[PDB]
Structure formats: C-alpha cells, structure tokens
Amino acid sequence: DEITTAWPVNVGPLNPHLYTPNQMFAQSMVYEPLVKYQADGSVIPWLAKSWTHSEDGKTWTFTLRDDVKFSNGEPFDAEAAAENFRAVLDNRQRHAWLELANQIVDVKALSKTELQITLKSAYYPFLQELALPRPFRFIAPSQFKNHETMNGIKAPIGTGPWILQESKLNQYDVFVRNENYWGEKPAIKKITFNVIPDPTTRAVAFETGDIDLLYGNEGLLPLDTFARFSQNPAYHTQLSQPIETVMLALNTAKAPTNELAVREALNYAVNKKSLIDNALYGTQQVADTLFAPSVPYANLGLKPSQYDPQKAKALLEKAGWTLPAGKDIREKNGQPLRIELSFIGTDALSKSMAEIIRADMRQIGADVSLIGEEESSIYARQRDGRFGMIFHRTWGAPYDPHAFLSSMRVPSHADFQAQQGLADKPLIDKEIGEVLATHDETQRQALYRDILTRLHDEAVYLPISYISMMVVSKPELGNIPYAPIATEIPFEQIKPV
Ligand code: NI
C-alpha cells in the first residue's frame, strides 16, 4: 500500500544536475543512470543495455534501451541523453570534484539508440561515476529552462520508478509510483515524506505509529533513541556493515596543527573505544585510518596510533611543547598549546564527542577550545579553511576512495583546505590525477598506496570511527535491504505488509 517517512528538510526542486538544496535520495528516486552500481563494486546495464570500448579506452559506445519514456511519456533518446550531458557540462567547474565531468570531450547521439562518449584520457572510474546519484542522470530535455539546467528546470521529469507529486504544502513531499516505468514495478504505490525539522519530533512520530521507516545515518533520529529502540521489540532496527569514516580533519596550515609532531601526538590522545561506548552507544567501530582496509586499494597495512597518552606527551616534549610548573597546558616559546575544534552546535553527538575529545586532549597538555555553531556556518568554515580541527566524513561506496581523493584537489573544500600546509600537497595532487587515469593495476595500487600513506604518515586526519547505515522500521515491514550507494534508499525493494 503506502508508506510514510520523514526527513529534516524538503527534497528541493529535484534538478538532477545540481547539488544542495536537492536531496540526493530524492534525485535517485526520480532520475536514473546509464549503468547501475552494485554492492560488489561492479556496474550492470541500466538505461544503457550494452556498451563498446575502443582500444584507446577513450571512446565508449552505449546501446541504449529503446523502450523507456520519461514519466511524461516523452521518449528517452540518445538525443535526450546527449542533451543531458551537454546541460551538465555547461556548468563544468561546479562538478570539478568529480573527475568524469572534466574527462568528457564530446557526447554524440549517433542513432536513436546509440550514444558515443569520448574522454580526454582513459579514465578508469568511468562507469562507476556514470552510476552516481548526480550529476549524470536524465531529465526530459523538454524541461530545460533556456536549453539549460544550470539556472533551474521546469518540472522534475525523470525515467525512474517514482514521481514527485505537485507541491501543495511545504510540510509534505509526496512520491507516487510511476505506472509507466520501463522496469520492474515497486510494490509500494505512494511514499509520503513528512518534513520534520526536529530530531525528537521525528522519533515521537515513529513512536506514535505515524512513520513506517527511517533510513539514514545523518541524525535522522537521535542516537540515544536509536539505542533504546534497538532494545525494544515494539520496533525494529538495523546497522549495516560500516560504510564511511568519521574523523577530525586537522588544519596543517594553521598553528599549532601545522606541526607534524602535534598532529601525531593528537592521533595518540583519544580513547576512541571509550568515546564510541560513551558518546555513541557502542554503535560504530574504532577507525585507525582514513579508509577502512576493506575499501578498494586501501588494505595497506598502515600503522595505527592506538590510545597512548604517554607516546603523545613524548612527541610533544620532543617538539618543544613542555609543561610549565605545574600548569596542565604545554607551551612552546611561552605560547600555549591551544586548538580550536569547530562543530555543529545543534548536533548533540558532535557536542558529546567534542567534549570527550577536549578532555582526552587536555590529559596530554593540549587546551582545546570548543566552537559549536549553526550548520551553515560550519560548512563555510570547511570551505574557507577557517578551522583548527573540524569533523568530516567520507562518502561511502562507490565514492571511496577514488572520488573522495579526486575532490581533495578542489580549492574550496575541507580536505583541500586541511592539506594546505603540506610540502607534499602538490605531489599528492599530481598522483591523484595520475591514479585516476591509470590502467595498469600495479601502477594504480602503488599510487593509491603512496597517496594514502602520505596522508596517514603526515597525520592529516584523526580517524575516529567507521559509521554504518542505520534503519528503524515497523516490525511488520520485516528485514530492510541496503541500497549499494550510501545516500540512496531502497524504496523500490520494499514490500507492503
Ligand atoms: Ni556531496
């Protein structure tokens, strides 16, 4: 029958080619890619039924499916696809994070069913990136604004299994099944998203039976509630295997995290196991490295820095950071060891984790100053480089590691900003561009090794934990599957009671 859920914000215009305020989960319900990501890291035919490969690795020819219509009824053509790529590529610099956007030289519709794509070089992540939620998915060209999407679209018309119903009230986004869908019909016919800003209200609405499912891991319900729910059979909860890392990004261009010895010492200071148990209700795993070893090209045997306050103090001592009799905070040339940790003040877990971080770090003679602020000002901080330490997370499959590394080269973003003090930073960036264009496996693995190892050994990050996808479900829904892409929600696989 029908399902109701909630989300902190509306779904946005649903422009397939743009970013915030469009919500990616909603983008992926309405729009579809050429090729679909699978959990084993492979891609299957999707809107593209088959594709050829030149010896070059530079020109690609996709045979498209011939039986697909936009929810309009307008046909999904090679022309329609070519026209989407064009609209995408006219806003090129905005997609610079995603190397594929820079890679595409031309897109040509050869025939109604044949789509030719040429790259400037043999870009190995090609298919995986075509499969992402955005920007390479397809709105009916009829809905462009002035032969463009850059500056807005008309109606959000995709080929996918769900249709966004015309908005009457900002408090609801309603999706209805596409009964003209080319592919398999969802058993569920309607999904209603309540826009509920407050975490506690979303938990109450689930408690009073107004919500069938909450699928998400960005604070969709409070974690203490999640933990209580997991102990109560009135509810069903799940955690997937971990999918992304949560860390601190240390600013290598700002004193005193500009000093390698300080970053190394901070990587020994946090009792991560205790933090997870006490702030996170035991729901995540301890992270020693930027990427979990199960991430592609990331099983590198890097050396963990365990919780070891003694080793940290020694590093600090050796670097000239000494304790004044008997003050607790180290000074170097009379200057105290003071470090700012910025985080979102309305995020109760950022705040709890910050406090524990401050306390662990005080034990090693670092005075960390807590700066909690509204979300949008933390995001400006990330872009501006205005932080000592800031929380940050990776992006999951299939972004990790190649797209997360690719975006590090991009000037106005947290990882780019955090690495600015590194002598290494131009070389790391060079090697990022090189790995992406690689087709030899030995070359590929060794370049990924070098980039990740430099980042680890230069102690750019303070990995904290690996977080999973999280589900809270009315029990009658039974076990919920996980979409292979972290930010998608598998609505189409859900079976009604
Ligand atoms: Ni993003």
Curated annotation (Swiss-Prot):
It holds the Pfam family SBP_bac_5. InterPro entries: CntA-like, Peptide/Ni-bd, SBP_5, SBP_5_CS, SBP_5_dom. Keywords: Nickel, Periplasm, Signal, Transport. Its main location: periplasm. GO terms for biological process: negative chemotaxis; nickel cation import across plasma membrane; nickel cation transport; peptide transport. GO terms for molecular function: heme binding; metal cluster binding; nickel cation binding; peptide transmembrane transporter activity; transition metal ion binding. It is found in: Periplasm. The keyword Signal applies. NCBIfam families: nickel_nikA. Belongs to the bacterial solute-binding protein 5 family. Involved in a nickel transport system, probably represents the nickel binder. This is Nickel-binding periplasmic protein. The gene is nikA.
